[PDB]
From a paper:
The class I proteins of the Major Histocompatibility Complex (MHC-I) present epitopic peptide antigens on the cell surface, thereby enabling immune surveillance of the intracellular proteome by CD8+ T cells and Natural Killer cells (1–5). The heavy chain is comprised of three domains, the α1 and α2 helices define the peptide binding groove in the MHC-I structure, while α3 stabilizes the molecule by creating an extensive binding interface with β2m. We developed a method called ‘CHaMeleon’, to generate synthetic molecules that combine the peptide binding specificity of one allele (template or groove allele) with the TCR binding surface of another (base allele). X-ray crystallography demonstrates that chimeric molecules bridging divergent HLA alleles can bind selected peptide antigens in a specified backbone conformation.
Overlay of the CMV peptide bound to the wild-type HLA-B*08:01 and the B*08:01-A*02:01 chimera revealed an identical backbone conformation with a deviation of 0.495 Å in RMSD values between the two structures, in agreement with our previous results for the HLA-A*11:01-A*02:01 chimera. Altogether, these findings support the introduction of a novel P5 anchor within the HLA-A*02:01 groove to generate a chimeric molecule with a distinct peptide repertoire, without affecting the adopted conformation of the bound peptide. We then refolded the chimeric HLA with a B*08:01-specific photolabile peptide (EBV* = FLRGRAJGL, where J is the 3-amino-3-(2-nitrophenyl)-propionic acid) with a Tm=48.2°C, to perform UV-mediated peptide exchange experiments. Altogether, our peptide exchange data further support that the HLA-B*08:01-A*02:01 chimera can preferably bind epitopes with high affinity for the binding groove of the template allele, namely B*08:01.
Author numbering:
A (entry chain A): 2 to 41, 44 to 274
B (entry chain C): 1 to 9
C (entry chain B): 1 to 99
The structure:
């Protein structure tokens, strides 16, 4: 299981400015490419993408720019469907890509668009039909159905998308086909004479997916637990922690469990 | 490798 | 839809005084993507600050990482100012070595 994803953002800066256009490319949890309309061409975020020729950089840059022009026209159309003013700043997001299974063969494809934080239209799991969120989206769906664009999107997601994911997985194997098992440890913080907080720490792991669960005398605990969002360290690894409020003098009764792809057997942490 | 979007919303 | 940022201030490696490390401010879950972030050493903005490329999560909310190299000292206080259209005033989140 591996994935390739593009996250695209288009912000209509009004009156003074052309829109802003961003596209970020990800293999699993590793950024490998960036396109930015306001950058002083393509800037490689990964060494193995730089191994690709200058033709790759110029083609993708042309594609990005064509997409920019398409988003710009879409932003204007969206402004019109909803009868909004050209003086407003609006946001148009896109996220697409493909997943592969253990055989590096096509498993899933997805292509979703959001307008101003709200799901606008998305390709179905079958990559055959579309899902609209309101009447404007219904117009897009009818336009897109009339043009048969779900065919091209499926083609790309089952074809080009998978082929290039495989190529990057082989070419950047040392960065992408690796796992860094989490280094764990436990902190303690008194709340009062008879309540305390245990915090279970996971540091420097990769991929980002992890499961941190607390146990009281071996039983699962979700009451009085807090689980923060996984965060990047900057060095290509991730951090995460989970906390539980315990009675003072019962800290030893609680254990933390860490499940991770780099762990054949889950880790157990005691205080 | 980017996909090319050919159709306006 | 508008969404207030969540902020996490932390170090790249366990803070041990005297060794060079990296101060991270990770802002996430916000929307629209326009946002202003500063890293503070005892109140004073640091100049040499970088930041990652604009991305977003499964619920379409944006996230950024702002980082800078430094050397942890037991006297200096580090923090993070974040302004956003959802905030009436800039939010200051102090660093916490335990956090």
């Amino acid at each position: 299981s591996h994935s390739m994803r593009y996250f695209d953002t288009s912000v209509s800066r009004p009156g003074r400015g052309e829109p802003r256009f961003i596209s970020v490319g990800y293999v699993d949890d590793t950024q490998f490419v960036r396109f930015d309309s306001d950058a002083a061409r393509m800037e490689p975020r990964a060494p193995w993408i730089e191994q690709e020729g200058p033709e790759y950089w110029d083609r993708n840059t042309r594609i990005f720019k064509t997409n920019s022009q398409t988003d710009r026209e879409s932003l204007g159309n969206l402004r019109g469907y909803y009868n909004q003013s050209e003086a407003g700043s609006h946001t148009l997001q896109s996220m697409y890509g493909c997943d592969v299974g253990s055989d590096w063969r096509f498993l899933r494809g997805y292509n979703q668009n959001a307008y101003d934080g709200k799901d606008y239209i998305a390709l179905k799991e079958d990559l055959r039909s579309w899902t609209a969120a309101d009447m404007a989206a219904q117009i897009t769906k009818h336009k897109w159905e009339a043009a048969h664009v779900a065919e091209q999107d499926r083609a790309y997601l089952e074809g080009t998308c998978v082929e290039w994911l495989r190529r990057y997985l082989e070419n950047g194997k040392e960065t992408l086909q690796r796992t860094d098992a989490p280094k764990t440890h436990m902190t303690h913080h008194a709340v009062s004479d008879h309540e305390a907080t245990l915090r279970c720490w996971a540091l420097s792991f990769y991929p980002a997916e992890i499961t941190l669960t607390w146990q009281r005398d071996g039983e699962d605990q979700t009451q009085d637990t807090e689980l923060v969002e996984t965060r990047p360290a900057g060095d290509g690894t991730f951090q995460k922690w989970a906390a539980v409020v315990v009675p003072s003098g019962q800290e030893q009764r609680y254990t933390c469990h860490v499940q991770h792809e780099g762990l054949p057997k889950p880790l157990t942490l005691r205080w | 490798e980017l996909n090319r979007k050919m159709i306006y919303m | 839809i508008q969404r207030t940022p969540k902020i996490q201030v932390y170090s790249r490696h366990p803070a041990e005084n005297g060794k060079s490390n990296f101060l991270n401010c990770y802002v996430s879950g916000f929307h629209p993507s326009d946002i202003e972030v500063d890293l503070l050493k005892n109140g004073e903005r640091i100049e040499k600050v970088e930041h990652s490329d604009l991305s977003f999560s499964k619920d379409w909310s944006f996230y950024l990482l702002y980082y800078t190299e430094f050397t942890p000292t037991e006297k200096d206080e580090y923090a993070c100012r974040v302004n956003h259209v959802t905030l009436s005033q800039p939010k200051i989140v102090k660093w916490d070595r335990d956090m």
